[PDB]
């Protein structure tokens, strides 16, 4: 509360460390469905159904330009990528499986780096 603060957690490396995680996600062999924004002209249904499209390139641009106020808003966009994928793709598809694998990969890196 006013003039009463928990001890200051060192967040000075968070930007660098989120960048490294995002690099590792970018270079994963199953990243290919997630590298670029879904083409809303060429994928019937996507625009209407997926209210907040997100992809790795868009996260990378947001990260590089100071549009994440803290490491949690960064994790929310990463998870959004996989939530969108599960909304649109059957579990038993190449893209559906890719999304599950990537989410697992991300959540381990996240825990090991920050928890």
Residue with tokens 């509360």: 1
Sign of CA dihedral 58, 59, 60, 66: positive
Tell me if 96 sits within 8 A of 83, measured CB to CB. no
What torsion do the CA atoms of 8, 12, 13, 19 make, to the nearest 10 degrees?
A: 120
> Any alpha helices (H) in the chain, and if so which ranges?
14-27, 46-49, 56-64, 71-88, 94-114
| Residue 97: C-alpha distances to residues 7, 66, 89 (Å) | 41, 32, 9
User: Residue 100, CB half-sphere, CA atoms under 13 Å: how many?
Assistant: 8
Cα–chain-centroid distance for residue 101? 13
Return d(Cα 42, Cα 78) in angstroms, integer.
Answer: 23
Return d(Cα 25, Cα 39) in angstroms, integer.
Answer: 21
- Domain assignments of the chain as residue spans, ordered by start: 1-115
Return d(Cα 99, Cα 93) in angstroms, integer.
Answer: 10
38: CB partners within 8 A, 6+ apart? 46, 50, 53, 55
Return d(Cα 8, Cα 54) in angstroms, integer.
Answer: 32
Tell me if 74 sits within 8 A of 61, measured CB to CB. no
Q: What is the largest CA-CA distance in the chain?
A: 55
The structure's method of determination equals X-ray
**Three-state DSSP class for 1?**
coil
Cα–chain-centroid distance for residue 32? 14
In CATH, what is the architecture of 1-115? Up-down Bundle (1.20)
State in Å, rounded, how far the first CA of the chain is from the last one. 25
Q: What six digits make up the tokens of 30?
A: 């199953």
């Amino acid at each position: 509360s006013m003039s009463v603060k928990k001890p200051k957690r060192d967040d000075s490396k968070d930007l660098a460390l989120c960048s490294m995680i995002l690099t590792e996600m970018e270079t994963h062999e199953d990243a290919w469905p997630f590298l670029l924004p879904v083409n809303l002209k060429l994928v019937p249904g996507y625009k209407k159904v997926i209210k907040k499209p997100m992809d790795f390139s868009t996260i990378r641009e947001k990260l590089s330009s100071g549009q994440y106020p803290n490491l949690e808003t960064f994790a929310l966009d990463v998870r959004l990528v996989f939530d969108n994928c599960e909304t649109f793709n059957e579990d038993d598809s190449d893209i559906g499986r890719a999304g599950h694998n990537m989410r697992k990969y991300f959540e381990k890196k996240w825990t090991d780096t920050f928890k």
